[PDB]
């Protein structure tokens, strides 16, 4: 059972990691940080809590080393106090995009110069399905986008077994608003944004960067994300050509194939029924990654969709998933929660 304390605990992502560990039965939340909520109970800030817990957030000066610091602060900030934090703890899960990328530069066009570049490339890639080995041997582990995410776990089955055209990958998510985080802006107050539809990043979204340096053979892919106004939620869809000769059914082989036996990967093939296709609504909650697409047979047009709760599996469900990897403990450990319905 090791001990585990997380940086920027009063956030979005902070708060889910504190919500999944606090039922992890080999974890032990002992610190929990905020500057602003000092002093608070923890549910004072995150109300499903209410007396499950008797933490209360500690300014951050007060924190003490762990067996295990998750870092929640906003992008930048971890990197520019590495030394401060890294020492705390010999395992580091970092849920920011401070050391997602390897490339130094390609960091620098989305983020503007990285203050600590030799560290780029130390940090494993949290992406269980794909980095499963490495995982095993990190001990810094770093969370990815929410939209990376789905984008990667629809996408890398295809790219890996060569199902599609070079031609362009266009991908269209349909993201919600706490996808932008616990701080208010006039955008966000509630009946300014309630029922809206924002365009929130046509181009140029920093999660390209992560997308393609993740993705087997240089493949040119472009994202554009649109805001609704749910409050969870992802749904990844792409468009894209499939080589000749390829079916339906093989499409499925290269799934089955690249994701046989994964714990949190849900290939939605549904020929009938109301709930045909992957939808965010009902992964909520939840660490599940739904799959499932539609081949336009006379166009070869492949249409590829993934849902995920961009809270959990999109952002601490993943992360846990993979510390538990690197723990050597179950995988599902802490993150078997199957969701509503309705």
Not at 149 to 165: C, D, F, I, S
Not at 228 to 236: A, S
Request: proline share 8%; hydrophobic share 40%; net charge neutral.
């Amino acid at each position: 059972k090791k001990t585990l304390s997380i940086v920027g605990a009063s956030g979005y992502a902070g708060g889910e990691f504190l919500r999944l560990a606090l039922s992890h039965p080999y974890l032990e939340v002992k610190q929990v940080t905020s500057r602003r909520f000092a002093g608070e109970p923890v549910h004072f800030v995150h109300p499903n809590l209410r007396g499950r817990t008797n933490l209360k957030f500690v300014p951050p000066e007060k924190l003490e080393p762990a067996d295990i610091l998750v870092l929640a602060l906003p992008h930048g900030v971890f990197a520019r106090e590495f030394d401060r934090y890294s020492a705390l703890a010999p395992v580091l899960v970092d849920l920011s995009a401070d050391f997602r990328l390897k490339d130094p530069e390609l960091y620098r066009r989305y983020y503007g110069e990285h203050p600590r570049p030799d560290l780029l490339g130390r940090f494993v890639y949290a992406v269980p399905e794909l980095y499963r080995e490495a995982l095993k041997g990190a001990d810094w582990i770093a969370g990815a986008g929410c939209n990376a995410t789905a984008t990667l776990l629809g996408l890398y089955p295809l790219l890996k077994a060569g199902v599609l055209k070079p031609t362009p990958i266009f991908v269209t998510l349909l993201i919600s608003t706490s996808a932008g985080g616990a701080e208010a802006s006039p955008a966000s107050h509630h009946p300014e944004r309630a029922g809206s539809i924002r365009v929130y990043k046509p181009t140029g979204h920093r999660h390209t960067a992560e997308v393609v340096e993740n993705l087997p053979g240089r493949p040119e892919v472009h994202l554009t994300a649109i805001a609704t106004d749910r409050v969870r939620g992802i749904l990844m869809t792409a468009q894209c050509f499939v080589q000749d000769g390829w079916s339906e059914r093989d499409v499925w082989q290269a799934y089955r194939e690249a994701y046989a036996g994964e714990p949190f990967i849900r290939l939605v093939k549904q020929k009938k029924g109301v709930h045909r296709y992957p939808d965010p609504r009902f992964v909520q909650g939840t660490n599940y990654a739904d799959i499932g697409f539609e081949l336009e047979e006379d166009t070869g047009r492949l249409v590829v969709m993934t849902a995920i709760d961009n809270l959990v599996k999109g952002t601490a469900g993943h992360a846990l998933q993979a510390l538990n990897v690197r723990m050597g403990w179950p995988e599902t450990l802490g993150l078997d929660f199957p969701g509503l319905h309705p």
